[PDB]
Amino acid sequence: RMYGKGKGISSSTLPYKRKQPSWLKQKPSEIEDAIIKLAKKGQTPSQIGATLRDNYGIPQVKSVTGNKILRILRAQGIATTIPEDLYFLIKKAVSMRKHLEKNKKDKDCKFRLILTESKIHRISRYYKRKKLLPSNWKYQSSTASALI
Amino acid sequence: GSGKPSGLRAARKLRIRRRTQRWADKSYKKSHLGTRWKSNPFRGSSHAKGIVVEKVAIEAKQPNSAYRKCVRVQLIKNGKKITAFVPGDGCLNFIDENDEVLVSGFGRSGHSVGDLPGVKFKVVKVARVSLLALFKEKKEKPRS
């Protein structure tokens, strides 16, 4: 782990075959249409992948089509201005900041908030090094609450 | 790893550490300190001249028992006073109240030697004649 002491190794592992399974019947066109329709309802890419795995029968999107979910989302200009994992980090930070504003003796929350903000700054630097964020993107710790 | 950096661009760190850690060596710090020109009666010389002021006797250390013969000398060079040992059997009888003597080190440059406590000097000449040639008693006589 990056901060604590954990050493777990749980993960998913892909099969050896890279081609689509022989029993699958869909065409790439309606698969992309399903991606777009499902993203219109307000789901993140990871949620979209999970829903396609469970509610429809598609083991991997990249096996059927040739692209990944984020690329086909960006092909129509639908991707969010702020990447997903950074957004989740910001949401956690703002929630912790509110709770802390209510309770000034909770020392543990201060420690955890410091750790999350360090993570935010590191990820933001990485995204700014590529052209995925404007160069003058700062994350002030006071104006972040209104960032939808 | 073994506590050092071993990379192809880590020379400054190694250089600076070796520079800083050398000052913990006693020998290096003795030879490179600026105060040696000040706290040294000889001031870096190997020999010096002076005037005898007083004869004394000094006790030996605990397991031994004797009375060692020395003199007190005022240096011509800077006026300081030291104590020097007179070696030989009856060699103190060759020295008068205020003669001129060469003295040298005593073999352990900064340290006392053997049985005498706190003596680091040794007389070699008196009245411009050698102490050894005078103790041999067959070579020369004091310059009257």
Binding site: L14, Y16, R18 | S6, L8
Partner: protein, 129 residues
């Protein structure tokens, strides 16, 4: 983190050889490991070896002949001129009549005798007795 795959491979080979294991496995592979293994094979220090294909970095199984004394890397790849080989081999090798010091050279990977034969220098990789 890893920081190197050659050092881990050679360390695993050395540890297995001290016990008489007749076979050992190397988890991460690379072209440099392949060239180094081929060179040890050429001098008759190991048997044949096999390359396994997963859709990630592959794996290797080698056959041992109870014949290696030591095989280690020199981690900082110092660059060596053609006329400095003598000092390095005097310091590193156990005799003047056997053992090999391996360099990477603009003409490929080779030991010190071949490097002298080709009139070239390079950077140091490792050695094996």
């Amino acid at each position: 983190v890893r920081m190197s795959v050659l050092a881990d491979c050679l360390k695993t080979i050395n540890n297995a050889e001290k016990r008489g294991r007749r076979q050992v496995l190397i988890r991460p592979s690379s072209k440099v490991v392949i060239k180094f293994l081929q060179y040890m094979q050429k001098k008759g220090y190991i048997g044949s070896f096999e390359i396994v294909d997963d859709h990630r970095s592959g794996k290797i199984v080698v056959n041992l002949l109870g014949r290696i004394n030591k095989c280690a890397v020199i981690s900082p790849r110092y660059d060596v001129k053609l006329d400095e080989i003598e000092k390095i081999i005097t310091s590193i090798l156990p005799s003047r009549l056997f053992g090999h010091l391996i360099l990477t050279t603009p003409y490929g990977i080779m030991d010190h005798e071949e490097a002298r034969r080709k009139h070239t220098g390079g950077k140091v990789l490792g050695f094996f007795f």
